[PDB]
Amino acid sequence: ATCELALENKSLPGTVHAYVTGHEQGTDRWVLLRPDGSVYRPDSPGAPQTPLPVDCAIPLKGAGAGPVVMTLPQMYGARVYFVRDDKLDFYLNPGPSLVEPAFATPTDPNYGRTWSFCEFTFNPQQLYANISYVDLVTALPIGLTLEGDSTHTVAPLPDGAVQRIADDLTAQAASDGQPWDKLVTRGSDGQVLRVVSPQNLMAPFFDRPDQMPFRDLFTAQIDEVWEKYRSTDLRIDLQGGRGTLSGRVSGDTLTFEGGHTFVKPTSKDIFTCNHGPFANDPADSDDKKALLARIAAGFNRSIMLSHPQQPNGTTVADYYKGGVTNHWSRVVHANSPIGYAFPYDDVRPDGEPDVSGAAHDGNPRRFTVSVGS
Ligand SMILES: OC[C@H]1O[C@@H](O[C@@H]2[C@H](O)[C@H](O)O[C@H](CO)[C@H]2O)[C@@H](O)[C@@H](O)[C@@H]1O
Ligand SMILES: OC[C@H]1O[C@@H](O[C@@H]2[C@H](O)[C@H](O)O[C@H](CO)[C@H]2O)[C@@H](O)[C@@H](O)[C@@H]1O
């Protein structure tokens, strides 16, 4: 089966291009959709850093003129990119391995361009798409609509969001002296191109951790939490009817009934949600994995001291209070109507609404991706 892909520019002036990349079903082979509606499957190149030998930029009709509609073949690990005025430079490495534009590295050929992307997957069970602010927010916000069985819509960042986000974060940096302003990327014309989450600014310095930005942001708060739960229980509700598990800190290990163990975390762990006690290990039981997500979420939201039982009984109003918190997440949530801002933002108290930026349908007919408003 297939379905229609509709690319639209609602209101921006001039020229916008879209790119569709992914892996085709089972072959695992990199693949790009072509302006003419056909598929381009590159062969492995003769050298690294080889320019994409076919032009796969898809020109969008003018703002308001309607959509470019083509046939979407099934694929996974897929993306839709947009870029204004220019095109994007893609490359090939021996494999074939597609070299993707790196929003968070300043030497990248596209670093100064105005571009964005969202991620999707289309297998025979469903089309699943996702607007996510876990990594970046851009001056080219994407919204989408999926028609099939149901109709699902995901609202974009509103016009101007990325400027507000950049200003709020610079304002934060002015007060706490932390490198929040370095997450901003401004072109040559003064305009804001994107803002990136702290982990994307920290990962360069994983090599040299003694120079990592933000390395000591959470250090005091973490020690406060660990000392609290040396003398009283931390109750984590696994939810879904699985009930709660109580934990205590012995020395530097937080241990829950069932022998689930978490070492003292670092600011790095909290921001990545994937190191220290939050590293994903396939050798972990499901309870251990439930505990991990909820504890990472609570540190990001700074509710570990205020709420000994969580997430049930907490609300969004409890999140991101005080000087030391995940201000990236706080500010993105303030300036966006829906979508996640950090890797475990999906943790929510029972009864609270789903605020994920995903849309999915088991029988997709048209997948509309748009820019502008
Ligand atoms: O910016 C988000 C991250 O993109 C990552 O690539 C995604 C995953 O591999 C996922 O499975 O597939 C989607 C496309 O459907 C990709 O976007 C990953 O490469 C990260 O480095 C990157 O920060
Ligand atoms: O669309 C890309 C994003 O897809 C995500 O993984 C999906 C969900 O887990 C869903 O339940 O199952 C579908 C498979 O049909 C997955 O595509 C999401 O977890 C991201 O990693 C990814 O960027």
XYZ file of C-alpha atoms and ligand atoms in Angstrom:
419
model
C 0.000 0.000 0.000
C 0.930 3.692 -0.431
C -0.619 7.062 0.314
C -0.482 10.679 -0.808
C 2.124 13.086 0.546
C 1.091 16.755 0.322
C 3.712 19.491 0.771
C 2.430 23.041 1.278
C 3.743 26.510 2.039
C 0.925 28.473 3.655
C 2.264 32.014 3.730
C 5.996 32.497 3.364
C 7.096 34.676 0.419
C 9.200 33.348 -2.396
C 10.666 29.884 -2.779
C 10.689 26.878 -0.447
C 12.057 23.397 -1.160
C 11.193 20.101 0.529
C 13.298 16.922 0.787
C 11.957 13.448 1.675
C 14.570 10.932 2.928
C 14.295 7.479 4.522
C 15.040 3.728 4.430
C 12.913 1.641 2.126
C 10.976 -1.313 3.509
C 13.301 -4.153 4.545
C 16.099 -3.562 2.029
C 17.428 -1.006 4.599
C 18.590 1.029 1.577
C 18.738 4.823 1.820
C 16.223 6.492 -0.478
C 15.035 9.970 -1.530
C 11.811 11.121 -3.140
C 12.247 12.982 -6.359
C 10.571 16.159 -7.748
C 9.004 14.038 -10.501
C 7.378 11.677 -7.980
C 9.875 8.836 -8.453
C 12.386 7.346 -6.032
C 16.146 7.864 -6.116
C 18.155 5.088 -4.504
C 21.834 6.116 -4.426
C 24.647 3.659 -4.918
C 27.647 3.691 -2.622
C 30.058 6.461 -3.690
C 33.666 6.232 -4.748
C 34.825 8.417 -1.865
C 33.530 10.017 1.337
C 31.779 13.390 1.234
C 30.500 12.798 -2.313
C 27.803 15.312 -3.370
C 24.396 13.798 -3.955
C 24.517 13.207 -7.733
C 20.768 13.752 -8.275
C 18.817 16.922 -7.408
C 16.187 15.699 -4.964
C 14.963 19.146 -3.888
C 11.180 19.325 -4.391
C 10.029 22.864 -5.305
C 6.913 23.961 -3.426
C 4.183 25.992 -5.115
C 3.969 29.635 -4.043
C 2.466 30.517 -0.660
C -1.250 29.851 -0.851
C -1.194 28.132 -4.243
C -2.036 24.689 -2.879
C 0.012 21.586 -2.243
C 2.523 19.543 -4.160
C 0.916 16.074 -4.016
C 2.941 12.921 -4.709
C 2.822 9.226 -3.863
C 4.557 8.304 -0.624
C 6.196 4.856 -0.720
C 6.675 2.951 2.496
C 9.861 3.721 4.426
C 11.214 4.048 7.948
C 13.683 6.332 9.666
C 12.202 8.930 7.299
C 12.219 12.740 7.349
C 10.614 15.677 5.539
C 12.919 18.708 5.295
C 12.046 22.232 4.250
C 14.413 25.044 3.348
C 13.787 28.656 2.326
C 15.349 30.410 -0.697
C 18.194 27.872 -1.008
C 18.481 24.128 -1.367
C 20.190 21.741 1.054
C 23.535 20.041 0.368
C 23.359 16.282 0.976
C 26.391 13.991 0.558
C 27.179 10.281 0.314
C 29.702 8.177 2.216
C 30.729 4.620 1.284
C 27.835 2.329 2.092
C 25.805 4.019 0.746
C 25.492 6.174 3.882
C 23.539 9.461 3.517
C 25.300 12.457 5.109
C 22.420 14.526 6.768
C 22.605 18.290 7.446
C 23.903 18.762 10.984
C 21.853 21.548 12.591
C 24.077 21.612 15.693
C 27.581 21.774 14.155
C 28.695 25.232 12.940
C 31.042 23.983 10.177
C 28.130 22.339 8.352
C 27.385 23.629 4.803
C 23.752 24.213 5.717
C 24.485 25.752 9.130
C 23.700 29.271 7.918
C 20.599 28.304 5.966
C 16.968 28.462 7.083
C 15.865 24.803 7.230
C 13.909 22.373 9.384
C 12.629 18.813 9.417
C 10.202 16.417 11.045
C 10.500 12.625 11.362
C 8.080 9.896 10.261
C 7.771 6.170 9.525
C 5.456 4.408 7.082
C 5.322 0.577 7.314
C 2.228 -1.624 6.611
C 0.889 -1.309 10.162
C 0.702 2.522 10.192
C 2.037 5.884 9.153
C 3.524 7.529 12.260
C 4.831 11.113 12.220
C 6.240 13.291 14.982
C 6.788 16.968 15.668
C 9.380 17.083 18.435
C 11.408 19.835 20.102
C 13.722 17.460 21.913
C 16.662 18.681 19.795
C 15.909 22.004 18.111
C 13.422 24.728 17.267
C 13.706 26.622 13.974
C 12.569 29.713 12.033
C 10.708 27.312 9.667
C 8.124 25.611 11.904
C 6.385 22.525 10.521
C 2.794 21.504 11.155
C 1.040 18.428 9.845
C -2.293 16.703 9.222
C -2.796 12.942 8.783
C -6.002 11.717 7.140
C -6.937 8.060 6.960
C -9.231 6.329 9.383
C -9.245 9.411 11.609
C -8.056 12.951 11.001
C -5.209 14.077 13.267
C -3.614 17.517 13.265
C -0.478 18.744 14.984
C -0.152 22.506 15.372
C 3.213 24.126 14.539
C 5.337 26.500 16.475
C 3.479 29.787 16.003
C 4.947 32.484 13.800
C 7.803 34.036 15.756
C 8.303 31.229 18.276
C 12.022 30.802 17.679
C 12.784 34.479 18.315
C 10.867 34.400 21.631
C 12.614 31.191 22.648
C 16.024 32.682 21.883
C 15.237 35.906 23.773
C 13.890 34.073 26.855
C 16.981 31.869 26.954
C 19.417 34.775 26.593
C 17.445 36.484 29.365
C 17.915 33.353 31.466
C 21.658 33.341 30.754
C 21.878 36.980 31.841
C 20.518 36.071 35.275
C 22.243 32.724 35.992
C 25.364 33.173 33.871
C 24.810 29.731 32.344
C 25.495 29.214 28.601
C 21.814 29.255 27.593
C 22.473 31.957 24.992
C 24.978 29.768 23.106
C 22.126 27.484 22.058
C 21.010 30.222 19.641
C 22.108 30.337 15.986
C 21.784 33.647 14.139
C 22.464 33.962 10.426
C 24.407 36.838 8.901
C 21.371 39.121 8.637
C 20.725 39.200 12.387
C 17.820 36.757 12.126
C 17.491 33.694 14.373
C 17.857 30.404 12.506
C 17.479 27.798 15.224
C 17.948 27.110 18.900
C 19.254 23.743 20.119
C 18.738 21.775 23.308
C 21.613 21.766 25.824
C 22.686 18.190 25.018
C 23.412 19.254 21.416
C 25.756 21.905 22.812
C 27.282 19.504 25.363
C 28.110 16.496 23.159
C 31.175 18.078 21.497
C 32.713 18.274 24.948
C 32.009 14.663 25.893
C 35.639 14.221 24.835
C 36.756 16.859 27.385
C 34.205 16.796 30.245
C 36.079 19.402 32.264
C 35.063 21.995 29.659
C 31.503 20.761 29.014
C 28.955 23.606 29.067
C 26.381 23.206 31.886
C 28.449 20.483 33.613
C 27.714 21.866 37.094
C 24.191 23.252 36.579
C 22.460 20.425 38.450
C 25.328 19.325 40.695
C 24.110 20.950 43.918
C 20.426 20.115 43.357
C 21.294 16.448 42.745
C 23.174 16.248 46.021
C 20.154 17.765 47.771
C 17.845 15.113 46.301
C 20.207 12.266 47.162
C 20.484 13.427 50.780
C 16.687 13.704 51.092
C 16.077 10.101 50.073
C 18.734 8.765 52.396
C 16.206 9.415 55.204
C 12.776 8.926 53.522
C 11.177 6.936 50.701
C 10.771 8.022 47.087
C 7.594 6.488 45.661
C 7.400 6.149 41.863
C 4.056 5.194 40.340
C 4.755 2.897 37.373
C 1.176 3.579 36.160
C -0.913 1.492 33.814
C -2.185 -0.276 36.916
C 1.256 -1.589 37.862
C 1.338 0.390 41.112
C 4.151 2.124 42.942
C 7.657 1.142 44.017
C 9.465 2.720 46.965
C 13.158 3.580 46.842
C 15.960 4.714 49.147
C 19.509 6.019 48.705
C 22.299 3.975 50.322
C 25.580 5.823 49.969
C 25.312 6.832 46.296
C 22.912 4.180 44.956
C 19.182 4.822 44.884
C 17.684 1.353 45.292
C 14.010 0.436 44.788
C 12.247 -2.675 45.966
C 12.992 -5.258 43.334
C 16.698 -4.440 43.466
C 16.452 -1.714 40.815
C 19.503 0.515 41.106
C 20.383 4.042 39.989
C 23.740 5.699 40.609
C 23.966 9.379 41.473
C 23.356 11.327 38.247
C 25.176 14.229 36.640
C 23.932 17.293 34.786
C 24.962 15.410 31.652
C 22.696 12.478 32.524
C 19.715 14.777 33.153
C 20.067 16.579 29.839
C 20.775 13.530 27.643
C 18.415 11.154 29.508
C 20.843 8.499 28.304
C 23.965 8.410 30.507
C 24.759 7.558 34.105
C 21.684 5.988 35.724
C 19.586 6.868 32.617
C 21.627 4.968 30.015
C 19.390 2.612 28.062
C 20.442 -1.008 28.652
C 18.555 -3.862 26.917
C 19.292 -5.993 30.018
C 16.787 -3.941 32.093
C 13.431 -5.266 33.266
C 10.276 -3.346 32.382
C 9.850 -2.028 35.915
C 13.458 -0.800 35.867
C 12.699 0.932 32.556
C 9.520 2.515 33.918
C 11.429 3.752 36.985
C 14.208 5.188 34.808
C 11.858 7.264 32.658
C 9.931 8.691 35.597
C 13.085 9.603 37.560
C 14.689 11.295 34.559
C 11.476 13.212 33.942
C 11.293 14.372 37.570
C 14.872 15.700 37.556
C 14.321 17.622 34.307
C 11.153 19.165 35.807
C 12.789 19.781 39.223
C 10.101 18.046 41.291
C 12.375 15.556 43.111
C 12.455 17.591 46.321
C 8.873 18.828 46.229
C 7.085 15.540 45.409
C 8.129 12.292 47.124
C 5.367 10.466 45.176
C 5.174 10.953 41.417
C 4.040 11.318 38.714
C 0.453 10.860 39.983
C -0.449 13.715 42.300
C 1.761 16.225 40.413
C 0.617 18.643 37.711
C 2.278 20.776 35.047
C 2.065 23.724 37.475
C 4.654 21.994 39.682
C 7.259 21.832 36.868
C 10.334 24.033 36.299
C 10.143 26.159 39.433
C 13.294 27.766 40.788
C 16.646 28.823 39.448
C 18.074 25.395 38.614
C 15.848 23.484 36.197
C 15.733 22.497 32.529
C 15.115 26.006 31.191
C 15.299 24.758 27.618
C 12.227 22.651 28.337
C 10.523 25.398 30.358
C 10.912 27.982 27.567
C 9.970 25.703 24.654
C 6.765 24.698 26.484
C 5.946 28.353 27.161
C 6.303 29.199 23.483
C 4.700 26.185 21.828
C 1.161 24.771 21.887
C 2.025 21.027 21.773
C 5.040 18.671 21.441
C 7.796 17.340 23.707
C 10.907 19.270 24.721
C 13.071 16.604 26.346
C 13.512 12.840 25.927
C 11.179 11.740 28.749
C 8.566 14.506 28.355
C 6.068 11.679 27.596
C 5.868 10.970 31.360
C 2.578 12.489 32.510
C 0.277 12.114 35.530
C -2.782 9.952 34.964
C -5.790 11.981 33.865
C -3.613 14.638 32.241
C -3.927 15.217 28.494
C -1.535 13.788 25.900
C 0.640 16.671 24.746
C 2.867 14.742 22.316
C 3.468 16.108 18.864
C 2.699 12.768 17.186
C 0.041 11.776 14.665
C -0.534 8.201 13.551
C -3.121 6.249 11.580
C -3.396 2.580 10.696
C -4.705 3.258 7.182
C -3.178 6.505 5.922
C -4.568 8.173 2.818
C -3.011 11.667 2.789
C -0.126 12.991 4.895
C -0.043 16.809 4.687
C 3.155 18.534 5.853
C 3.224 22.357 5.681
C 5.220 25.443 6.601
C 3.934 28.938 7.236
C 0.624 29.892 8.846
O 17.406 15.498 15.736
C 16.889 14.236 16.129
C 17.898 13.095 15.958
O 17.696 12.480 14.707
C 18.072 11.134 14.848
O 17.693 10.402 13.701
C 16.344 10.000 13.916
C 16.250 8.556 14.436
O 17.283 7.748 13.894
C 14.929 7.891 14.083
O 14.944 6.490 14.373
O 14.674 8.102 12.709
C 14.345 9.467 12.509
C 13.698 9.630 11.157
O 12.437 8.996 11.208
C 15.619 10.263 12.614
O 15.279 11.629 12.612
C 19.534 10.928 15.249
O 20.341 10.726 14.088
C 20.088 12.026 16.167
O 21.512 12.143 16.055
C 19.396 13.378 15.984
O 19.764 14.232 17.062
O 8.575 8.879 13.275
C 9.880 8.830 13.830
C 9.717 8.614 15.312
O 9.103 7.350 15.434
C 8.963 6.904 16.764
O 8.828 5.487 16.935
C 7.499 5.149 16.537
C 6.592 4.815 17.718
O 7.328 4.128 18.714
C 5.384 3.998 17.271
O 4.648 3.493 18.383
O 5.808 2.898 16.491
C 6.299 3.345 15.253
C 6.568 2.148 14.362
O 5.477 1.933 13.479
C 7.600 4.055 15.505
O 7.943 4.683 14.286
C 9.684 7.694 17.857
O 9.851 6.861 19.009
C 11.000 8.363 17.444
O 12.165 7.641 17.880
C 11.088 8.555 15.944
O 11.807 9.751 15.652
